[PDB]
Design a protein around this ligand. Structure first.
Ligand code: CA
Ligand code: CA
Ligand code: CA
Ligand code: CL
Ligand code: CL
Ligand code: CL
Ligand code: CL
Lengths: 153, 151
């Protein structure tokens, strides 16, 4: 296509994420595919977040489930639970890496955002979303979005 | 449940019938959209030929059709349909569909459908570049159909 894509073999936009990738299954990271990445991209960034987190546990209403940056722009697929040859940032629990959906109160939406950058960012551990967004500023050449839902059954 | 774009006139990678080319009446081919996400507020269609002779078009890409602000429940466009959406500029410099008319070889014609989470502004003379620049940040699904033409 004419624009960068972020998709998953496991679910289409707005459909349920399989149980395997939630706290009700093994809780591993879902498969994701990047395609049509601009040739000028030098790295990719992934941010996964839940704007449906109960506000009584998170006042700003947004829980970050995964941060990955400095991915290769030709990475193509991340297989489920795969090794990440890139830098992982901090989720909202304050730990590195992927946190599975585990919505206590309702069905939630989980948004997966991809960003293509025309630079490689500094190699830093412990990166939060706020810090990452600052580092990206001025370097984002394209974005893509995927969303899936989860509701405990 | 991925979004799909199909045509009752040709399956993926197969020849586009003559009537949709310059060798016939040259009307737009029938198209069907399936499994458009619920969250979509509009559809976009971009049809282009990356096999255009580079001596004619240096960048190697000729746009044959741009449509945006299609209803997300439009479901199908009949052959040569009156379009209830906005048509943009093709590379010939005209609004609407330009048929395949490859002079030199078999070409591939790619049809890309995009579901957006917004309705774009109603504008005249919209080019592919302007359309794509506005779509970034709003695309929620993509589907591809391809057909070939050879004189
Ligand atoms: Ca007929
Ligand atoms: Ca004219
Ligand atoms: Ca109008
Ligand atoms: Cl995938
Ligand atoms: Cl959750
Ligand atoms: Cl059709
Ligand atoms: Cl042509």
């Amino acid at each position: 296509s004419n624009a960068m894509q972020l998709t998953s073999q496991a679910f289409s936009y707005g459909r349920p994420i399989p149980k395997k990738y939630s706290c009700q299954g093994v809780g591993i990271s879902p498969p994701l595919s990047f395609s049509d990445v601009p040739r000028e991209a030098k790295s990719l960034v992934l941010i996964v977040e839940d704007p449906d987190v109960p506000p009584s546990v998170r006042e700003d209403g947004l829980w970050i489930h995964w941060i990955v940056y400095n991915l290769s722009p030709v990475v193509s697929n991340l297989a489920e639970g795969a090794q990440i040859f890139a830098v992982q940032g901090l989720n909202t629990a304050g730990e590195i890496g992927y946190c599975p959906p585990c919505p206590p109160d309702a069905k939630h939406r989980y948004y997966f955002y991809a960003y293509a950058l025309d630079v490689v960012l500094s190699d830093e551990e412990g990166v939060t979303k706020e810090q990452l967004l600052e580092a990206m500023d001025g370097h984002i050449i394209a974005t893509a979005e995927l969303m899936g839902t989860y509701e405990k059954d």
